[PDB]
Amino acid sequence: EDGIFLVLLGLLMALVSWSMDYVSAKSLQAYKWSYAQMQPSLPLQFLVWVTFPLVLILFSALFCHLISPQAVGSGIPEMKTILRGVVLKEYLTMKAFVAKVVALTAGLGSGIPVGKEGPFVHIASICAAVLSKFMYYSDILTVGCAVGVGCCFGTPLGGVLFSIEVTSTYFAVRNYWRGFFAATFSAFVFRVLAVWNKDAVTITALFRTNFRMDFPFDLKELPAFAAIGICCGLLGAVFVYLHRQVMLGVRKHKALSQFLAKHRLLYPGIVTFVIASFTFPPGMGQFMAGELMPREAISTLFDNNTWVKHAGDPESLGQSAVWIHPRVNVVIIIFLFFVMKFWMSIVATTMPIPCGGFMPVFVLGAAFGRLVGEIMAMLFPDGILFDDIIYKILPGGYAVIGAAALTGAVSHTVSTAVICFELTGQIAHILPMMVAVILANMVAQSLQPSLYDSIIQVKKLPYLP
């Protein structure tokens, strides 16, 4: 019967993931078009920029309130609690499935720092439970997690490895085989649908990069990759620390908690309003590449161009031209993007909506990575002679490493190295990604608990040692 269960779980999740991306994309196109149509008047540009995401976030928060409060958050803290032996039954119901899928879709389409992966671990877990009931949570949820990550982005190995790291002491080998099968199948279907819908041509990586694959880096820049690893460790520790402090403040502050406890939806309202206010292009958005939606932030941060060099005509960068302000060195623009998004990301992940920190952190990591890359590009401008031609620093490589390393530091995982290279489609940098991730973890684990463990402690979940 496993053949039926595993195929249907895999297939149905491929369809949920694909449909969600389809709709999310349409929301963002509607947003950009609507904004563009107001081009001659700043008050209307502001109105659109801000109200479009207020509507979607308030809808998301409200929908969960009305259908299933258990849909709020990333799921993973509760799934871990269940894997440890305490069955929080209320998080594996069809009501949560509906609330989660609907509200998440609305959230993603807003442009607000809301991840997708976290929620998919939960969505797949529920599906696995429901199919099983229709037709032993340690095995249901383990397969679920692998499928969730797999179908979320089209990243099979990422999923399987994740399903191991989320366990307690012992992992059953039988789940390795079941998870691997289902996650691979699901990912395959997901990418084929993209081709069918004229958005891929062949089966490809989700955020495919275009690095040289020929002398991709020298040994002389390995110290930079190592430095990114260590720095990501520290940044990750800070991210988690501050996240905790925000959650506790909102819940415990003597007066704030009285107010927000009654007037629900103020918190979503205000958080969203402020993030939108700062990102408006004519205001600070021009200094933060604020026109970029999460996927475009990734697409441009993993570019193969060297922004500090592309003078004369910035339009030659295509979409990446958004980073080249007429009066500000691109290094500063990257710095400001990182800093501003850092706190926006922390706060956004505390809103009462479906959300997660994987993709927010991934982007912050990429930004940090280019900051390092673009700076070295100004220090070693001459390049290296090999086989009669000159090879130069390729900052996109640093972005890829930074994304993996910071994610690692925040979650306490090494699976992120794999998810990241499956997303880019190129493995020129495997060994330095893996080393940077290990270093990031050694540092982060010595300072602060995983993001998920901080949440488990804060929410006082019945997590057995």
Breaks in the chain, named by the residue before each, with C–N above 2.5 Å?
135
For Cl ion, the closer CB: 308 or 346: 346
172 counts as binding a copy of itself under rule CB under 8 A? yes
Tell me whether residue 337 is annotated as binding: no
- Residues whose CB falls within 8 Å of the CB of residue 116, separated by 6 or more in sequence, listed in order: 20, 104, 108, 152, 153, 356, 358, 359
As measured in angstroms, the least distance from the Cβ of 232 to Cl ion is 17
Q: Is 195 in the site for a copy of itself (CB under 8 A)?
A: yes
Q: Which stretch binds a copy of itself (CB under 8 A): 178-186, 229-237, 266-274, 320-328?
A: 178-186
Q: Which residue has the tokens 């389409």?
A: 109
Backbone angles phi, psi at 13, to 5 degrees: -65, -30
Q: Judged by CB under 8 A, which of 309, 430, 457, 462 binds a copy of itself?
A: 430
d(CA 215, CA 224): 17
Per CB under 8 A, 434 contacts a copy of itself: yes
Site for a copy of itself in 88-107 (CB under 8 A): none
| Closer by beta carbon to Cl ion, 53 or else 285 | 53
Decide if 172 contacts 151 (C-beta within 8 A). no
Which amino acid, 149?
A: V
d(CA 425, CA 427): 7
115 binds Cl ion (CB under 5 A): yes
The helix (run of H) or strand (run of E) holding residue 23 is helix 2-36
Q: How far is CA 430 from CA 292, 298, 330, in A?
A: 28, 19, 27
Candidates 11, 23, 205, 458; binder of a copy of itself (CB under 8 A) is 205
Q: Torsions phi, psi of 448, nearest 5?
A: -140, 150
Residue nearest to Cl ion (CB): 115
Q: Which of 21, 78, 117, 303 binds Cl ion (CB under 5 A)?
A: 117
Residues 6+ positions from 269 with CB-CB distance below 8 Å: 54, 57, 58
33 binds, among a copy of itself, Cl ion, none (CB under 5 to 8 A by kind): none
The partner in contact with residue 457, picked from a copy of itself, Cl ion, none with C-beta cut-offs of 5 to 8 angstroms by kind, is none
- 136 assigned binding-site residue: no
Collapsing DSSP to helix, strand or coil, 253 comes out as coil
Q: Which stretch binds a copy of itself (CB under 8 A): 86-94, 201-209, 283-291, 332-340?
A: 201-209
Tell me which of a copy of itself, Cl ion, none is bound by residue 358, counting a contact when its beta carbon lies within the kind-specific cut-off of 5 to 8 angstroms. Answer: Cl ion
Nearer to a copy of itself, 204 or 286 (CB): 204
User: Could you say which of 25, 164, 321, 375 contacts a copy of itself (CB under 8 A)?
Assistant: 164
Cα separation, 320 vs 399, whole angstroms: 14
Residues 308-367 that bind Cl ion (CB under 5 A): 356, 358-359
Asked if 408 contacts 417 with a C-beta cutoff of 8 angstroms, the reply is: yes
Of the candidate spans 186-194, 235-243, 310-318, 399-407, the one that interacts with a copy of itself by CB under 8 A turns out to be 186-194
CA atoms within 13 A on the CB side of 382: 3
Please tell me what DSSP assigns to residue 75: S
Q: How many CB atoms lie within 10 A of CB 430?
A: 12
170 counts as binding a copy of itself under rule CB under 8 A: yes
| Of residues 179, 169, 175, the one with CA closest to residue 80 | 169
Is residue 110 within 8 Å of 91, Cβ to Cβ?
no
390 binds a copy of itself (CB under 8 A): no
Q: Which of 202, 255, 315, 388 binds a copy of itself (CB under 8 A)?
A: 202
Residue 74 among known ligand-binding residues: yes
* 169 binding partner (options Cl ion, a copy of itself, none; Cβ < 5 to 8 Å by kind): a copy of itself
The verdict on 171 binding a copy of itself (CB under 8 A) reads yes
Query: Residues comprising the binding site for chloride?
Result: 74, 358, 452
- Which residues in this chain contact a copy of itself in the complex, by CB under 8 A? 154, 156-157, 164-165, 167-174, 176-177, 180-181, 184-185, 187-188, 191-192, 195, 201-203, 205, 210, 213, 215-219, 386, 414, 418, 421-422, 425-428, 430-432, 434-435, 438
